[PDB]
C-alpha cells in the first residue's frame, strides 16, 4: 500500500490536531476572562 | 538548568530554521529516472530538476507541475509548495519570539508563542511531506534535501516541547 | 514491513511525534498528568491498541485522542488487509504458458535443428514463439548448449532454454542440478 | 507533411507508395495513384450485390491495379486476381494500453 | 485481493465494447465465421448499440484512446504494431493473432 | 512482581488490556516492543488464516482438459484411444496431443 492510498487519513489526523489546538486557545481565553 | 534550557532552544531554533530553509532552496529532494532538456538519471527538488550524469549534466529545468477538484487542489498546493514555505515562516517567527523572549522579560507569554509557533511549524511540514510524496506518485530514492527537511521536523518539535517546559517552569514557581 | 510502503512507516513515526507533542501541549496549559513522557506512552499504546492507565479529560485533549484513534484503526486494518492479500495472491508453466508471458525470455541454439523447427513452423504457438525469438534483443539464441545452460543458471529464473529432451535430461541430472525440464516434448524426432 | 509544396503522383508517401514505384519499375509501366473515393477497402452489400471501395473500383474497370494493404480473401479472389502476399498479418486486439478519502 | 490475454476475455465480458472497421476484411471475416467464439463475437457486434464499428483505423485508434480503456479495437496486426510504436503509444496489442493471412 | 509480570505480558499478547502499566523508562521499553510483537504476530495469524480459507474456498479438468497434474489416460488398443486419435474437435485434439506425447 502506497501513501496515496491512505493519504486521506493523514489529512484528517493533522486537521484534528489543528482544530484541537484552536479549541484550547478558545478555552484558555474564555477561562482567562 | 534554565540557562542550558534556553541555550538548547535558541540553538535548536536556528538549526530547525537552517535545516529546513536549505531543503526548500536546494534541488536534491528525489533521485528519479527522468529527463532534462533520451532519459537520464536526474535529481529533482521542489522547483528544478537536473541531470546527474552524461553530456547534459548540470542542465536544470523548472519542474512543470501541471499536465476535477480533488486532484486540481492537490497539485495546486504542491505547485506553489504552500506548506513547506509556510513552515519556514512559522519557524522564522518562532525564532524571533525566542530571541525577543530574552530581550523582554516583562511578559512570559512570548516564549509560549514560540512553542506554539514551532509545534505548528512541524505540523505544516508533515503536510508538505505527505503532499509532496502523494503528488510525486501521480524506481526512486530521496536525497539529502528531503532528509534535511525531515530532520528539521524532529528538531522543531523538540524545541517546541522545551519552549513550553520553560514557560511551565516560569509560571509554576511564581504561583508556587 | 512489506504490507505498507516505506513512506507510510516514516509518516506513522512523524505523526506519532506530532500527536504526542500536541497532546502534551494542549493538556498542560489547560484548566482540567499528561507530561511529554506520558503523552508518548499513551500515544504508543493507542497505536498498538493496548490501552493505558490514563485518558485525556479536557475537550481539546480528547479531540487529539479521538483522531489518533481513527488513524490507528484505519492503518492497523490496512496492514492486516494488505498482508492477507499479499499472502493469498502468492498461494494462487508449459509451452503455451511460456508463449503467453514475456517476463521470462526463451531462446534456442544458433544454426541448430530446433531453430530451423521454429523458423519453418506453422503451428500458432510456435509461430508466435518464433516471431518473439527473431525480434528479441539481446539475442535469445546461443552458440553452444553450455552457453544456454549457463544462461538459464545465471538468469535467476528469467531465461528458459529450448533444447533437445536428451541433452535436457542429461543436464537436469548433472550437478548442481539447479535446472528442471518443464512440460512435455514439443515434437518427436531422432538422431 | 506540407503536401501543398508537392504536386502530382509525388503528393504522397508510405510503404505502398514505394512498393507501387518498385513494381512499376520492374513491370515497366507508368501509373497515376488515385485514392479510392468511397474510402472503403471493399465488400459487396448482400442486398444490392454491389462491390464498393478498391475492390469495386477494380472490378468495374475504373482502376487497373490496387497497391493498398488489401487483404487476400476468398470472396475477393472470386472477382479479382491477387499476387503472392507481400506482407503477413492477423486479426489482433488492441487495448488503449487511488483518490483521497478512499479508505 | 480481487484487484490482484486471449480471444475469450473479450467475448466473455460485456463491459468493454469491441468493434471493427466498416466494409473491411475483418468485419467480413467475423460475419461469415462459423467458429463458436467468432460467431458469438459477430452476434454481439451486429446487435451492439451504439455501433461498435468505425469508419477508419484512425477513428478506432482515437476511440480506444478516448474511451479510457473501455473500447477494444479488432484490427490487423501490422497496423496494431505500427500504432503501438508511434507516440503517444498508449495502446497495446493483447494476445496472439486470431488468424493468419496477408496483403 | 514475577506473577504480575506474567499476567501483564499474557494480557498484552491477547490485546485484552491490563490492570497496571509500566511507569519506568526501562519497563516501558519492554512493554513497547512486546506490544509491537503482539501486533505483528496476531495480524499475521489473521492474515494467513484468511488466505488458507480463501485459496481453498476458491470437463473443467477436461474443459481445457486436465489442465493440471490430473494426468488422464485411456485403455490401449480400445475404441476410446482410437476415438481420441482420430478426433478433430478442439478439446479432443488437445487431449490427444497431450496423451500421445505425455510420459
Residue numbers in the entry:
A (entry chain C): 783 to 815
B (entry chain G): 5 to 41, 55 to 84, 92 to 162, 172 to 209
C (entry chain B): 514 to 545, 566 to 625, 630 to 728
D (entry chain C): 406 to 502, 508 to 513
E (entry chain C): 621 to 624, 630 to 728
F (entry chain A): 568 to 625, 630 to 674
Q: What did the article's authors report about this structure?
A:
AMPA glutamate receptors (AMPARs) mediate rapid signalling throughout the brain, and orchestrate various forms of synaptic plasticity that underlie learning. These cation channels assemble in various combinations from four core subunits, GluA1–4, with each contributing unique gating kinetics, trafficking and subsynaptic localization. AMPARs exhibit a modular architecture with a two-layer extracellular region connected to the transmembrane ion channel (transmembrane domain, TMD). The ion channel is encircled by diverse auxiliary subunits, modulating receptor gating kinetics, pharmacology and ion flux, with the transmembrane AMPAR regulatory proteins (TARPs γ2, γ3, γ4, γ5, γ7, γ8) being the most abundant.
Desensitized GluA1/γ3 substantially deviates from this behaviour and, despite the limited NTD and LBD resolution of this highly dynamic state, we could trace major transitions throughout the receptor. Interestingly, these transitions take place despite the presence of TARPs, whose extracellular loops remain associated with the LBDs, and accompany their motions. The appearance of non-domain-swapped receptors reaches approximately 30% and is greatest in the class closest to four-fold symmetry.
